[PDB]
Design an enzyme around this catalytic site. Structure first.
Site, mmCIF file in Angstrom:
data_model
loop_
_atom_site.group_PDB
_atom_site.id
_atom_site.type_symbol
_atom_site.label_atom_id
_atom_site.label_comp_id
_atom_site.label_asym_id
_atom_site.label_seq_id
_atom_site.Cartn_x
_atom_site.Cartn_y
_atom_site.Cartn_z
ATOM 1 N N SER A 147 -2.165 9.729 2.537
ATOM 2 C CA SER A 147 -1.768 10.253 1.243
ATOM 3 C C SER A 147 -2.262 11.662 0.969
ATOM 4 O O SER A 147 -1.813 12.333 0.034
ATOM 5 C CB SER A 147 -2.283 9.397 0.089
ATOM 6 O OG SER A 147 -2.314 7.974 0.217
ATOM 7 N N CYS A 206 -10.231 3.222 -0.737
ATOM 8 C CA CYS A 206 -8.770 3.258 -0.639
ATOM 9 C C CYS A 206 -8.159 2.389 0.425
ATOM 10 O O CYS A 206 -7.588 1.378 0.067
ATOM 11 C CB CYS A 206 -8.226 4.706 -0.409
ATOM 12 S SG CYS A 206 -6.434 4.989 -0.300
ATOM 13 N N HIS A 243 0.166 13.739 2.807
ATOM 14 C CA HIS A 243 1.411 13.788 2.066
ATOM 15 C C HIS A 243 1.494 14.988 1.148
ATOM 16 O O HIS A 243 2.596 15.477 0.949
ATOM 17 C CB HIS A 243 1.586 12.547 1.217
ATOM 18 C CG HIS A 243 2.230 11.358 1.935
ATOM 19 N ND1 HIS A 243 3.032 11.270 2.994
ATOM 20 C CD2 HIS A 243 1.943 10.065 1.602
ATOM 21 C CE1 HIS A 243 3.226 10.025 3.339
ATOM 22 N NE2 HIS A 243 2.574 9.310 2.469
ATOM 23 N N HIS A 291 -9.477 11.458 -1.595
ATOM 24 C CA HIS A 291 -9.600 10.365 -2.578
ATOM 25 C C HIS A 291 -10.326 9.179 -1.934
ATOM 26 O O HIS A 291 -10.773 8.300 -2.672
ATOM 27 C CB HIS A 291 -8.235 9.812 -3.154
ATOM 28 C CG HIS A 291 -7.199 9.339 -2.137
ATOM 29 N ND1 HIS A 291 -6.303 10.126 -1.591
ATOM 30 C CD2 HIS A 291 -7.102 8.096 -1.538
ATOM 31 C CE1 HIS A 291 -5.690 9.446 -0.680
ATOM 32 N NE2 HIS A 291 -6.147 8.200 -0.617
ATOM 33 N N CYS A 294 -6.978 9.768 4.759
ATOM 34 C CA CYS A 294 -5.840 8.918 4.515
ATOM 35 C C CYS A 294 -4.546 9.741 4.635
ATOM 36 O O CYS A 294 -4.523 10.930 4.326
ATOM 37 C CB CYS A 294 -6.015 8.355 3.130
ATOM 38 S SG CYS A 294 -4.678 7.433 2.289
HETATM 39 N N1 LIG Z 1 2.622 6.466 1.699
HETATM 40 C C1 LIG Z 1 2.000 5.347 1.353
HETATM 41 O O1 LIG Z 1 1.661 5.104 0.197
HETATM 42 C C2 LIG Z 1 1.779 4.452 2.523
HETATM 43 C C3 LIG Z 1 0.942 3.383 2.599
HETATM 44 S S1 LIG Z 1 1.048 2.548 4.135
HETATM 45 C C4 LIG Z 1 2.204 3.840 4.522
HETATM 46 C C5 LIG Z 1 2.825 3.951 5.867
HETATM 47 O O2 LIG Z 1 1.720 3.482 6.654
HETATM 48 C C6 LIG Z 1 1.070 4.641 7.163
HETATM 49 C C7 LIG Z 1 -0.378 4.462 6.712
HETATM 50 O O3 LIG Z 1 -0.766 3.072 6.926
HETATM 51 P P1 LIG Z 1 -1.281 2.518 8.377
HETATM 52 O O4 LIG Z 1 -2.766 2.299 8.278
HETATM 53 O O5 LIG Z 1 -0.532 1.309 8.874
HETATM 54 C C8 LIG Z 1 -1.054 3.979 9.431
HETATM 55 P P2 LIG Z 1 0.495 4.114 10.337
HETATM 56 O O6 LIG Z 1 1.458 5.226 10.020
HETATM 57 O O7 LIG Z 1 -0.094 4.092 11.712
HETATM 58 O O8 LIG Z 1 1.271 2.750 9.962
HETATM 59 C C9 LIG Z 1 2.547 2.439 10.551
HETATM 60 C C10 LIG Z 1 2.380 1.305 11.550
HETATM 61 O O9 LIG Z 1 3.652 0.684 11.780
HETATM 62 C C11 LIG Z 1 3.975 0.687 13.171
HETATM 63 N N2 LIG Z 1 5.440 0.778 13.337
HETATM 64 C C12 LIG Z 1 6.191 1.869 13.085
HETATM 65 N N3 LIG Z 1 7.492 1.554 12.996
HETATM 66 C C13 LIG Z 1 7.519 0.249 13.236
HETATM 67 C C14 LIG Z 1 8.680 -0.491 13.197
HETATM 68 N N4 LIG Z 1 9.858 0.082 12.962
HETATM 69 N N5 LIG Z 1 8.496 -1.815 13.364
HETATM 70 C C15 LIG Z 1 7.286 -2.350 13.540
HETATM 71 N N6 LIG Z 1 6.173 -1.625 13.593
HETATM 72 C C16 LIG Z 1 6.264 -0.281 13.439
HETATM 73 C C17 LIG Z 1 3.184 1.833 13.739
HETATM 74 O O10 LIG Z 1 2.857 1.597 15.115
HETATM 75 C C18 LIG Z 1 1.915 1.767 12.912
HETATM 76 O O11 LIG Z 1 0.992 0.824 13.458
HETATM 77 C C19 LIG Z 1 1.673 5.875 6.530
HETATM 78 O O12 LIG Z 1 1.851 6.902 7.521
HETATM 79 C C20 LIG Z 1 3.087 5.415 6.223
HETATM 80 O O13 LIG Z 1 3.981 5.609 7.347
HETATM 81 N N7 LIG Z 1 2.506 4.755 3.600
HETATM 82 ZN ZN LIG Z 2 -5.133 6.683 0.346
#
Ligand SMILES: NC(=O)c1csc([C@@H]2O[C@H](COP(=O)(O)CP(=O)(O)OC[C@H]3O[C@@H](n4cnc5c(N)ncnc54)[C@H](O)[C@@H]3O)[C@@H](O)[C@H]2O)n1
Ligand SMILES: [Zn+2]
Ligand SMILES: NC(=O)c1csc([C@@H]2O[C@H](COP(=O)(O)CP(=O)(O)OC[C@H]3O[C@@H](n4cnc5c(N)ncnc54)[C@H](O)[C@@H]3O)[C@@H](O)[C@H]2O)n1
Ligand SMILES: [Zn+2]
Ligand SMILES: [Zn+2]
Ligand SMILES: [Zn+2]
Lengths: 374, 374
Positions: free
Chosen positions: A48, A174, A51, A67, A46
């Protein structure tokens, strides 16, 4: 054999931030009372975890991360009820201590013994069950699942179906549960609704599934990356929109699209701009918007309070709002009943020694989910 | 007599912003189909009326303001079902057209024929039932209750109890119903809860009452103005805290106070700083915070999305989230049943000619509510 004696196994240690993981010979102390020591079978990677490595998520180092995981119980410490050796289990990074404010409350799930709010990196008694050459290694969110064996408190382990495929149900520890819970349990998506999912990584595909389980009649997937649309479709998006296709705003081309804005909107991208965007394009008088995840170094967003005045609801949650011990059993029982398929979300399984290799993929993004087999 | 003929009466006209109201001889055209023409008995002065006069609330001028009021039906236009002449009624500034998205939805109340989103200042057919010397005068939020007679569409009038004291139930036309609805219907305050009310003007006292009707076991009133605490106590505050008494933050001295933050928090001050403050001091994993009102010229607040991540809910609403035609009857029936007393909230009643006199009081703030009798 093992029961009672220290175990010596390989685990990946982050000796310091922004360095790679090292496979190290580690000793895994026996369980004290209300501890269970698990043998890991598969761990997901993941963001996180990653991070932690950038310093964004501050926790005590050196650390054993991980996790998201399922494994099998090796010994159980004195006074453990919930589990027995040989039980398939899922470590829980949101504990379910049973006794607190949040644990008795019928919607709070974020247990008051969580190690996120203030990470100590230890077991509930303030100590580590890990040492690599005398040096203590910290525990992560009371799970530390990037180890071949780990010790968790009894509030952080959930027993599951012995016939359950552990190389797929580890996602319920998760990533899938955080997204499906946002649609099913946090926003409470209703049958007929029109949902807009922002971001279509593996947590976003889980949301789409939630929406689908709830019976939404329209799930619009939105992503600036065109390439994410097929799998999304595949998992339930009725349509998909790429923001760089239009000249208009996206919240405009979405409310326009939806005759007044969508019912529920979810942001699984994690950034400020689309969080506020995802607020504005769900319905003015009764639209609900869930921030599924927000990264650890989040700054302040600027939002005009006016968007709430008409009746919009804005929620956030950890672990899909699920009470951990309660739900992870029922989510496996469901998966066993052929409802979700965690399969579209697993795009790479590596051996556990290719941990750093599993992160590079995470970090260049073509990987929905990587599973590390033990 | 009147039925069918134009009426000529005094009303207060705002010929232009940031000028006083003038009492003018006004002619009140007869009702077209689905209109009812009301004879005003008492009108409250709300800050939203005053918002018009500063230019903050942009609506077409010249205008007849007023929206908080009860009166008696004089004629009813062709095709009116809900009312009959001589019925006591309350004008509704949130209409209940019955047929729309928001009107069928079991929690949306902000009817799609509202004149707030885009003020036109006219009756539903695009025209005014008012002219002062040939010149048309605009209608305000489809009510214009600062007139001795007014015409409202049938979606904006609610019939009430003929024995009801109209010099007190006029508050249910806005101020009391906006605050009590926030505690009772929007946040859904539960029995035993601990509520924190921010700001203790007349809408804030209404919230305190809501909380009390819902059975909260602790209602903390908070106000930098010490002098507001007695009436608040009187109406249900179990304690009251003045922010300039402490050296600590207020959200700290409130969560501290509450062993983890309060259940529900309400902001009836209307500013950015305390809106975000009121978010942080309700419980992290299941606290709910309602912005009862936000002024028309609102800028953007800076809030860290992180406060939602643990499970806080943040809602906004117009008119206490009540469906207008539905509820204003039941809120009078309740008032008739000796539950609320609108009495602590009425601190000055003037004659309608002292309208400008009624606003100066509003504007220097020592006045909970001023009622203007006709
Ligand atoms: N840190 C957290 O608690 C948490 C949970 S979800 C989250 C964000 O999601 C990611 C993990 O979840 P995920 O499975 O979706 C993996 P990901 O980082 O791939 O998720 C981001 C998604 O949004 C898309 N995207 C990026 N910018 C835009 C935008 N401006 N407009 C529309 N679409 C866009 C990307 O193509 C991607 O599919 C993390 O890297 C983080 O950036 N962070
Ligand atoms: Zn997680
Ligand atoms: N514009 C709206 O839609 C709307 C609805 S409620 C609202 C705000 O409330 C007022 C009307 O509602 P009301 O009945 O309470 C009348 P009022 O303006 O008196 O409400 C503000 C209350 O908050 C108190 N107060 C001011 N600043 C603070 C502070 N920083 N911290 C704590 N307490 C403070 C004041 O003493 C007062 O009791 C409007 O003037 C506006 O300022 N605006
Ligand atoms: Zn707990
Ligand atoms: Zn008002
Ligand atoms: Zn309507």
């Amino acid at each position: 054999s093992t029961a009672g004696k220290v175990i010596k196994c390989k685990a990946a240690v982050l000796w310091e931030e922004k360095k790679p993981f090292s496979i190290e010979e580690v000793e895994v102390a026996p369980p004290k009372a209300h501890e269970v020591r698990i043998k890991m079978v598969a761990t997901g990677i993941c963001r996180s975890d990653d991070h932690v490595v950038s310093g964004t998520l501050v926790t005590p180092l050196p650390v054993i991360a991980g996790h998201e995981a399922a494994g099998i119980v090796e010994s159980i410490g004195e006074g453990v009820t919930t589990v027995r050796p040989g039980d398939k289990v899922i470590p829980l990074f949101t504990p379910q201590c049973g006794k607190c404010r949040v644990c008795k409350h019928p919607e709070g799930n974020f247990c008051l013994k969580n190690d996120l709010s203030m990470p100590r990196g230890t077991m509930q008694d303030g100590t580590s069950r890990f040492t690599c050459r005398g040096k203590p290694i910290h525990h992560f969110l009371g799970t530390s699942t990037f180890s071949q064996y780990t010790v968790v408190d009894e509030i952080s382990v959930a027993k599951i179906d012995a016939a359950s495929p552990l190389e797929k149900v580890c996602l319920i520890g998760c990533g899938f549960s955080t997204g499906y819970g946002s649609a099913v349990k946090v926003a409470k998506v209703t049958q007929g609704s029109t949902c807009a999912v922002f971001g279509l990584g593996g947590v976003g595909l889980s949301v789409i599934m939630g929406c689908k389980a709830a019976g939404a009649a329209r799930i619009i997937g939105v992503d600036i990356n065109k390439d994410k649309f097929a799998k999304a479709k595949e998992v339930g998006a009725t349509e998909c929109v790429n923001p760089q296709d239009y000249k208009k705003p996206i919240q405009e081309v979405l409310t326009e699209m939806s005759n007044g804005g969508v019912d529920f909107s979810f942001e699984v991208i994690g950034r400020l701009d689309t969080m506020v965007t995802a607020l504005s394009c769900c319905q003015e008088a009764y639209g609900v918007s869930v921030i599924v995840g927000v990264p650890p170094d989040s700054q302040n967003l600027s939002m005009n309070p006016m968007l709430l005045l008409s009746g919009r609801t804005w929620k956030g949650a950890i672990f899909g709002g699920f009470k951990s011990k309660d739900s992870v059993p029922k989510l496996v029982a469901d998966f066993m009943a052929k409802k979700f398929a965690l399969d579209p979300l697993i795009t790479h399984v590596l051996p556990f020694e290719k941990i750093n290799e599993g992160f590079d993929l995470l970090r260049s993004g073509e990987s929905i989910r990587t599973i590390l087999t033990f």
